[PDB]
Amino acid sequence: RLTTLNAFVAQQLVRSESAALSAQLAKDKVNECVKAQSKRSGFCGQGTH
Amino acid sequence: QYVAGYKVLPPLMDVNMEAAYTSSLLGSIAGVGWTAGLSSFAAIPFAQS
Amino acid sequence: SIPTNFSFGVTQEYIQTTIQKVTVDCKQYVCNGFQKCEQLLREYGQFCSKINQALHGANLRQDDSVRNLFASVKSSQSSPIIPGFGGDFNLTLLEPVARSAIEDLLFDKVTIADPGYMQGYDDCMQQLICAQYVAGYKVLPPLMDVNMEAAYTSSLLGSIAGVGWTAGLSSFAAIPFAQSIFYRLNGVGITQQVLSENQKLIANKFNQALGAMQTGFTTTNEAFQKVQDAVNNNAQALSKLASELSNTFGAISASIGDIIQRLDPPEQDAQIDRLINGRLTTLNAFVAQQLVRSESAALSAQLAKDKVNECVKAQSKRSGFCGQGTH
Amino acid sequence: FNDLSQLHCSYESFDVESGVYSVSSFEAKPSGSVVEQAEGVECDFSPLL
Amino acid sequence: CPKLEFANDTKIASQLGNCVEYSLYGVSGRGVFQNCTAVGVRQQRFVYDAYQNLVGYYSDDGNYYCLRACVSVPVSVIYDKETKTHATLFGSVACEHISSTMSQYSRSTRSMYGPLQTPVGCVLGLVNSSLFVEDCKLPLGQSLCALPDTPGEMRLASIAFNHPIQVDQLNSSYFKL
Amino acid sequence: PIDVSKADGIIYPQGRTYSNITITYQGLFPYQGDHGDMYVYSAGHATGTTPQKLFVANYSQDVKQFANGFVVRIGAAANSTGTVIISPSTSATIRKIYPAFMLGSSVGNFSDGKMGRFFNHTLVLLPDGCGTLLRAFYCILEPRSGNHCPAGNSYTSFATYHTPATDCSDGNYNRNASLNSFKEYFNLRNCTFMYTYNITEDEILEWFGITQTAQGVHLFSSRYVDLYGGNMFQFATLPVYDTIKYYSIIPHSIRSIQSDRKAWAAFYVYKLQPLTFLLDFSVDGYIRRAIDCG
Numbered sequence: 011r012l013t014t015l016n017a018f019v020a021q022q023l024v025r026s027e028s029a030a031l032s033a034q035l036a037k038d039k040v041n042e043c044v045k046a047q048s049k050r051s052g053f054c055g056q057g058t059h
Numbered sequence: 060q061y062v063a064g065y066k067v068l069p070p071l072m073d074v075n076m077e078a079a080y081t082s083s084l085l086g087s088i089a090g091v092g093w094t095a096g097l098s099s100f101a102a103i104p105f106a107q108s
Numbered sequence: 109s110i111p112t113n114f115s116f117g118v119t120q121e122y123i124q125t126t127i128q129k130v131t132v133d134c135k136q137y138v139c140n141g142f143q144k145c146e147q148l149l150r151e152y153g154q155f156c157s158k159i160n161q162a163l164h165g166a167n168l169r170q171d172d173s174v175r176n177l178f179a180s181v182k183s184s185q186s187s188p189i190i191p192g193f194g195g196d197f198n199l200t201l202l203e204p205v206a207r208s209a210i211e212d213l214l215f216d217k218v219t220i221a222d223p224g225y226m227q228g229y230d231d232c233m234q235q236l237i238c239a240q241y242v243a244g245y246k247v248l249p250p251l252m253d254v255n256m257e258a259a260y261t262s263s264l265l266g267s268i269a270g271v272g273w274t275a276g277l278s279s280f281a282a283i284p285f286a287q288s289i290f291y292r293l294n295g296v297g298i299t300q301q302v303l304s305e306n307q308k309l310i311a312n313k314f315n316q317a318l319g320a321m322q323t324g325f326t327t328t329n330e331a332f333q334k335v336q337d338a339v340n341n342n343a344q345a346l347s348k349l350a351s352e353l354s355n356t357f358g359a360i361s362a363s364i365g366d367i368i369q370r371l372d373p374p375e376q377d378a379q380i381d382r383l384i385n386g387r388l389t390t391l392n393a394f395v396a397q398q399l400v401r402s403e404s405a406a407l408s409a410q411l412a413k414d415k416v417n418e419c420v421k422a423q424s425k426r427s428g429f430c431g432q433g434t435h
Numbered sequence: 436f437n438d439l440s441q442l443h444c445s446y447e448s449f450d451v452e453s454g455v456y457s458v459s460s461f462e463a464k465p466s467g468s469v470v471e472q473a474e475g476v477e478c479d480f481s482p483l484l
Numbered sequence: 485c486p487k488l489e490f491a492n493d494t495k496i497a498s499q500l501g502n503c504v505e506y507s508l509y510g511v512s513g514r515g516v517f518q519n520c521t522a523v524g525v526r527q528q529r530f531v532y533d534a535y536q537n538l539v540g541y542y543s544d545d546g547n548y549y550c551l552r553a554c555v556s557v558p559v560s561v562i563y564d565k566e567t568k569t570h571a572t573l574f575g576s577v578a579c580e581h582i583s584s585t586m587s588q589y590s591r592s593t594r595s596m597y598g599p600l601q602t603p604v605g606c607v608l609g610l611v612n613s614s615l616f617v618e619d620c621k622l623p624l625g626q627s628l629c630a631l632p633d634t635p636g637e638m639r640l641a642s643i644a645f646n647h648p649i650q651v652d653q654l655n656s657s658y659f660k661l
Numbered sequence: 662p663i664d665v666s667k668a669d670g671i672i673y674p675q676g677r678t679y680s681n682i683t684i685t686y687q688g689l690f691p692y693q694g695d696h697g698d699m700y701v702y703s704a705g706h707a708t709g710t711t712p713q714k715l716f717v718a719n720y721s722q723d724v725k726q727f728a729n730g731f732v733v734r735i736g737a738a739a740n741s742t743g744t745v746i747i748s749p750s751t752s753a754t755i756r757k758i759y760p761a762f763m764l765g766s767s768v769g770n771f772s773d774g775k776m777g778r779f780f781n782h783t784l785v786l787l788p789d790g791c792g793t794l795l796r797a798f799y800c801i802l803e804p805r806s807g808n809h810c811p812a813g814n815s816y817t818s819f820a821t822y823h824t825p826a827t828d829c830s831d832g833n834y835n836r837n838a839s840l841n842s843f844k845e846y847f848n849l850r851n852c853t854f855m856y857t858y859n860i861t862e863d864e865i866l867e868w869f870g871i872t873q874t875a876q877g878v879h880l881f882s883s884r885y886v887d888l889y890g891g892n893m894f895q896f897a898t899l900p901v902y903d904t905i906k907y908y909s910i911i912p913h914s915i916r917s918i919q920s921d922r923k924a925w926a927a928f929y930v931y932k933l934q935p936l937t938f939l940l941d942f943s944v945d946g947y948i949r950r951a952i953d954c955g
């Protein structure tokens with residue numbers, strides 16, 4: 011049971027770090043091409059955003 | 060939620076907080092994205108935006 | 109809706125670019141210098157070799173990350189920094205006096221133990237500082253001496269007034285800082301008349317805004333908390349190695365010498381073998397943790413390079429990319 | 436024979452790349468021993484003798 | 485525990501400040517003793533840290549002494565390809581240890597050479613140089629680098645700073661572009 | 662109730678001390694804030710200068726399991742004054758006292774059927790001579806068959822009669838008067854470790870601890886090592902033969918005079934069980950703060 015719990019802790023920390031980095035990317039997207047009209051090609055929308 | 064032993068924590072924000080935030084963003088995106096600089100708010104009707 | 113009053117908001121950010129370079133002699137830690145222990149370790153063989161490979165590769169890759177970040181951040185042309193820099197704006201707390209004063213206060217207010225770079229051997233003869241050899245593991249110094257960082261920061265501070273006046277980095281425009289901040293504040297939607305008539309009030313606002321963070325170093329600072337968390341992460345990573353010798357992994361003692369001077373040889377062979385297995389498992393887990401931390405440090409170093417290349421040498425127009433409000 | 440022999444056998448080859456490499460730290464020889472703590476009272480062997 | 489004859493071999497003051505293998509009546513280990521102020525409970529006679537490691541001992545002869553470990557030299561090597569050249573570094577330690585008290589396998593010879601003191605410790609196999617290198621390929625530590633030749637030797641140079649192109653700042657209304 | 666944060670009654674580690682560190686440690690402790698097992702010592706009846714028939718409780722009729730030993734705080738009273746226990750109309754200055762413990766492994770009934778008779782060897786810890794004497798012996802007792810005697814008629818309990826007017830004079834100390842009081846009710850044989858402990862007397866609260874392990878019966882005290890503090894410390898390991906199952910106390914009374922009855926401190930008893938405690942070891946090695954887990 012302790013080995014199972016330790017593996018659960020490891021995968022939980024990995025998933026939490028991945029989710030935090032993806033949330034930082036989401037914050038960048040929402041203050042980049044949501045509050046304003048971007049000109050970057052395909053950064054957040056296929057075709058001309 | 061009890062029989063295994065883990066407790067699923069409640070989310071940090073309410074559904075109503077999510078609704079208020081999304082409403083504020085949907086109100087802002089009509090006006091902000093016409094002239095750069097985030098000091099002034101520019102609530103133009105959506106068609107002219 | 110249009111604002112009337114305004115201030116200069118200060119935002120403190122921390123990016124961890126590189127964790128502390130650490131290596132450990134495998135059989136020195138695991139065996140602790142006993143001959144029958146070493147003979148009982150030789151059948152595993154290449155395990156120490158492969159963990160040395162992993163640590164050396166991680167250290168060299170972090171060296172490449174440090175060199176890349178500190179070579180890309182180097183400005184092509186800069187200006188010397190003297191007392192009286194910036195004119196009416198009192199940014200002299202960022203003037204070097206070598207190390208800057210804000211870095212002196214930052215290093216003062218965080219718990220740092222130097223790993224005895226001069227006489228750590230003597231610091232164990234007559235004084236973590238001494239526990240680096242109790243289990244036995246090296247702590248490598250960083251890739252460049254503190255004066256190199258001082259030169260890089262001084263060059264970038266001398267060039268930050270001059271790079272951002274025209275697109276393209278071929279020219280250099282080392283303007284006095286007053287006209288620099290006048291044009292930078294004019295470009296973000298301020299008419300030239302009000303800045304031309306109200307230099308003194310905005311200068312005083314700038315001075316109090318910069319002076320507000322001098323006493324601000326406490327728990328309330330997010331970046332100071334992240335600095336403490338990174339230093340504590342390094343400390344607990346070293347303490348994980350420094351504390352596993354107490355564990356026996358089912359043995360009757362924590363000392364290999366006590367085992368070799370205490371027990372019947374055939375049973376102490378099994379005891380030593382279980383010690384070998386436990387210590388090697390701990391080292392393998394530490395290798396995996398070091399690799400994960402190295403990956404995170406490399407990604408954060410890339411992000412730091414992008415951030416210092418976008419909204420330091422130039423005035424970024426992205427809303428809140430690296431600073432809340434209009435940067 | 437020497438540290439370079441161990442470094443060659445660590446890479447399982449006769450050719451290694453240049454650079455800095457951690458090698459087995461040696462240990463200084465002990466200079467003696469100390470044997471003293473609270474004793475000086477002899478155990479009872481008179482009914483045995 | 486048993487007893488032996490002492491005279492002056494097993495006294496703490498006799499072997500003070502040296503690496504000795506202590507056997508204190510059921511406490512066996514190795515370390516260096518040193519004079520310290522009396523800390524802890526006198527009667528228990530054994531002070532420990534949070535890691536169950538002995539910190540010091542209350543002497544019957546005198547009082548509390550500290551003991552840390554039998555600290556010795558950690559060794560790193562630098563080796564160059566295509567030129568069979570190598571040198572040894574002893575980190576964070578002054579040029580104070582020589583070939584007398586060795587362990588492990590053996591050590592190599594360079595040529596027959598003073599031990600160079602450096603901010604990263606004491607280095608054998610190097611020579612001083614008033615040279616500056618901005619493109620170092622063997623990052624030794626801090627701002628120190630190893631430079632080869634093209635049977636030469638191994639040089640120790642300082643990792644310099646690529647000084648940027650300086651420009652002058654004006655206090656007038658004109659500008660230096 | 663014991664406040665572990667106030668550092669009241671915490672057994673020290675038996676062989677190793679520490680310094681200035683907050684460390685978790687697996688030891689033997691009582692539970693937090695236990696209200697104890699109050700037994701009080703009161704003087705007997707007195708008319709003028711005549712010590713009359715004594716005045717004691719029913720402590721001897723009840724027995725408890727030894728479990729993992731117990732601690733006793735002494736002078737939980739501390740310099741004070743209070744009402745005379747036998748005569749509530751009078752109040753006197755409280756003076757500390759030490760209790761006597763009867764320790765064994767077998768129970769039975771007395772001649773009259775009163776429960777409390779012990780077979781075989783028993784360990785008796787008897788204080789004597791104004792508290793300066795600490796006799797202790799794992800020896801054999803037999804009852805006596807006289808008047809008010811344990812194997813005889815008109816018997817309710819056995820106690821200690823103590824005349825400080827004849828015992829607590831300067832010097833002399835009546836040459837173990839309380840052991841002769843002990844011999845007034847019992848007969849004593851097959852003895853083991855007679856042990857003497859010269860101590861001084863004061864009015865400062867202290868601690869005694871008793872347990873048994875494979876070494877033997879372990880006795881702990883504050884007195885020798887920590888007078889002015891309150892920390893607990895090993896001092897004796899008596900070589901007992903058998904593991905202890907059961908214990909009781911010996912009631913004590915005082916043959917004082919009527920006009921000069923003196924108040925006596927009531928000790929507290931707390932049982933011991935293994936727990937894990939976080940201890941804040943100070944610089945000097947003493948314990949001044951500790952917290953629990955259970």
Ligand SMILES: *[C@@H]1O[C@H](CO)[C@@H](O[C@@H]2O[C@H](CO)[C@@H](O[C@@H]3O[C@H](CO[C@H]4O[C@H](CO)[C@@H](O)[C@H](O)[C@@H]4O)[C@@H](O)[C@H](O[C@H]4O[C@H](CO)[C@@H](O)[C@H](O)[C@@H]4O)[C@@H]3O)[C@H](O)[C@H]2NC(C)=O)[C@H](O)[C@H]1NC(C)=O
Nearest residue numbers: 738739740741863864865866888889890891943945947949
């Ligand atoms: C009932 O009656 C007796 C009779 O006097 C009282 O005894 C006195 O007890 C107090 C309490 O200890 C003595 O006061 C002194 O306190 C000093 C403070 O110690 C600090 O540091 C220690 C160590 O960490 C802590 O444990 C402690 O809590 C304090 O934080 C001590 O330094 C004193 O020890 C010194 O005493 C004298 C000088 O006072 C020296 O000659 C000694 O060598 C020693 O260094 C002492 O503990 C007081 O001294 C006692 N009186 C006498 C005459 O000795 C009882 O306290 C009283 N009961 C009460 C009042 O409740």
Ligand SMILES: *[C@@H]1O[C@H](CO)[C@@H](O[C@@H]2O[C@H](CO)[C@@H](O)[C@H](O)[C@H]2NC(C)=O)[C@H](O)[C@H]1NC(C)=O
Nearest residue numbers: 196197198199200201202209315318319320322
């Ligand atoms: C410029 O800023 C620096 C940094 O705060 C000032 O130096 C300190 O200022 C405080 C009060 O503002 C004084 O109490 C300290 O004694 C100053 N330090 C030293 C070493 O003197 C400096 O005064 C500021 N200068 C101006 C003109 O505003």
Ligand SMILES: *[C@@H]1O[C@H](CO)[C@@H](O[C@@H]2O[C@H](CO)[C@@H](O)[C@H](O)[C@H]2NC(C)=O)[C@H](O)[C@H]1NC(C)=O
Nearest residue numbers: 219521523524680681682683941942943944945
């Ligand atoms: C015992 O440990 C404490 C905890 O660190 C030490 O207290 C620190 O002492 C230094 C020096 O006076 C202060 O700068 C710190 O602020 C203190 N820390 C705290 C949390 O108060 C104490 O010095 C140690 N005692 C000894 C003798 O070393």
Ligand SMILES: *[C@@H]1O[C@H](CO[C@@H]2O[C@@H](C)[C@@H](O)[C@@H](O)[C@@H]2O)[C@@H](O)[C@H](O)[C@H]1NC(C)=O
Nearest residue numbers: 518519520521522542543545546547548549
């Ligand atoms: C240690 O030596 C003491 C003599 O004075 C000391 O001098 C130096 C070495 C410092 O340690 C300083 O703090 C002292 O004042 C003796 O008084 C002391 O007993 C010695 N310690 C022992 C024998 O354990």
Ligand SMILES: *[C@@H]1O[C@H](CO[C@@H]2O[C@@H](C)[C@@H](O)[C@@H](O)[C@@H]2O)[C@@H](O)[C@H](O)[C@H]1NC(C)=O
Nearest residue numbers: 579598599600601602611612613614640642
């Ligand atoms: C190697 O040379 C370094 C250069 O420093 C300068 O030159 C020497 C001769 C000294 O005068 C020194 O004070 C100067 O700053 C020295 O720093 C270094 O110590 C030299 N190496 C040794 C082993 O002496």
Ligand SMILES: *[C@@H]1O[C@H](CO)[C@@H](O)[C@H](O)[C@H]1NC(C)=O
Nearest residue numbers: 111112113114115116309313
């Ligand atoms: C702006 O704010 C400052 C302090 O926050 C105040 O002293 C000043 O009077 C304000 N000015 C205006 C025009 O509101």
Ligand SMILES: *[C@@H]1O[C@H](CO)[C@@H](O)[C@H](O)[C@H]1NC(C)=O
Nearest residue numbers: 767769779780781782801851
């Ligand atoms: C213990 O007591 C019982 C009951 O009186 C008796 O039968 C037995 O012989 C005693 N044993 C010893 C060793 O005293």
Ligand SMILES: *[C@@H]1O[C@H](CO)[C@@H](O)[C@H](O)[C@H]1NC(C)=O
Nearest residue numbers: 781801803848849850851852
């Ligand atoms: C010791 O015990 C035995 C058994 O009960 C008894 O016969 C003997 O008299 C005792 N010894 C003494 C000195 O009383």
Ligand SMILES: *[C@@H]1O[C@H](CO)[C@@H](O)[C@H](O)[C@H]1NC(C)=O
Nearest residue numbers: 793832833856857858859860
């Ligand atoms: C106890 O004190 C008395 C009085 O002087 C002395 O004769 C005796 O030897 C002492 N005993 C011990 C064990 O110290």
